[PDB]
Structure formats: structure tokens, C-alpha cells
Structure 1
Amino acid sequence: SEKQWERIQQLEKEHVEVYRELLITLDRLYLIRKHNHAVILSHTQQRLLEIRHQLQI
């Protein structure tokens, strides 16, 4: 019964960080659609969006 134990913590691993770039990359789509030219943004706006991720988590 221990075999599936170490199996799930790595499943806990490759499920959470990839959960994070799904957050950030999808946020680019809603930024990039209204402004096709603008993919760059200042430092504050990038990590003010990260604060939204922090509370959501």
C-alpha cells in the first residue's frame, strides 16, 4: 500500500506548478486579444497579477 504513496506526491508535484503556468499563460490570452501588439508590460503589472494568483491559491 506504500507503492501508490510515493506515486501520488510526485503526482502532487507535477499537478501544481503546471497549474500555475496555466494561470499565467491564459492571462496572456485575455491581455493579448484586446491588444494584439502589446505583449510586454511593466514590472508592477506583471506581479500585481501575481498577487491575484497568491490570494486565489
Structure 2
Amino acid sequence: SSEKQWERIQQLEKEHVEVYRELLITLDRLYLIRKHNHAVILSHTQQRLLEIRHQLQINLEKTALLIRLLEKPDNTNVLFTKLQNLLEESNSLDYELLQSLGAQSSLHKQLIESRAER
């Protein structure tokens, strides 16, 4: 029944991050409208900085209670082991991405020279 718990907490955390992102967006546009009267036609260069401050708030919070849980290794809570599983599957595939990209880029160069020859 543990797999059911992990699946359940998976869609709960998906909906959690979705609702928090859209909540932050709605809160910031609410501040923009309440300070103005109807100014909602803000440019791309301002919406992008809104996205930037959203992104830095998100990863700052992630690091902030990354500090809270990983500072003292309890090695008993299952959330701790979830963090090491997530990290060890996140950092595993990093080299193979760039290796495959470089190999397929060399393939693309081979395509270019074969096309020129033909």
C-alpha cells in the first residue's frame, strides 16, 4: 500500500506546485491592478521580470527548506530517503545528455557534408 501512498502524494504535490504558482501570479497581478486602476497591458519585458521573481522565489524556498531537512541527517524519516532517491536519479543522467547531443551533432555534420557531396 506504500506505492499507493507515493502515487497519492505525487499528484498532491503536482497540484500543490500548480496552485502555488498560479496563486503567486494572481497575487502579483492583483497587486498591480490594485495599485493602478486598470493597467493590465504590461509589456513582455515586465511580465518576464515577474516570471524571474517568481522563479527566484520558488528556488529560494526549495533551497530554504532544503536547509531545514538536510542539515542534520536523521536517517529515519522516509522523506529523507525520498530526497536522496530524487537527487540520485536527478544527477545520474547528466553526462549522457551532453554525450548524445554531441554525437548527434557530429551526425548532423556528416549529414551536411553528404548533402553537399550529393
* Distance in structure 2 (CA, Å) of the matches to 1:50 and 1:26: 13
- Report 1:9-20 matches (<5 A): 9-20=10-21
Higher-Rg member (1/2):
2
* TM-score of the two chains, using structure 1 as the length reference: 0.85
Q: Describe the superposition over 1:16-52 as per-residue Cα deviations: whole angstroms up to 9, x where unpaired.
A: 0111010011101110012112111000100111111
Aligned length: 57
* TM-score of the two chains, using structure 2 as the length reference: 0.44
* Distance in structure 2 (CA, Å) of the matches to 1:3 and 1:20: 26
Moved more, 47-56 or 15-24: 47-56
* Distance in structure 2 (CA, Å) of the matches to 1:3 and 1:34: 46
Give the alignment's Cα RMSD to 1 decimal.
9.2
* Distance in structure 2 (CA, Å) of the matches to 1:21 and 1:4: 26
* Distance in structure 2 (CA, Å) of the matches to 1:37 and 1:16: 29
* Distance in structure 2 (CA, Å) of the matches to 1:52 and 1:33: 19
Task: Give the unaligned 5+ runs of structure 1.
Answer: none
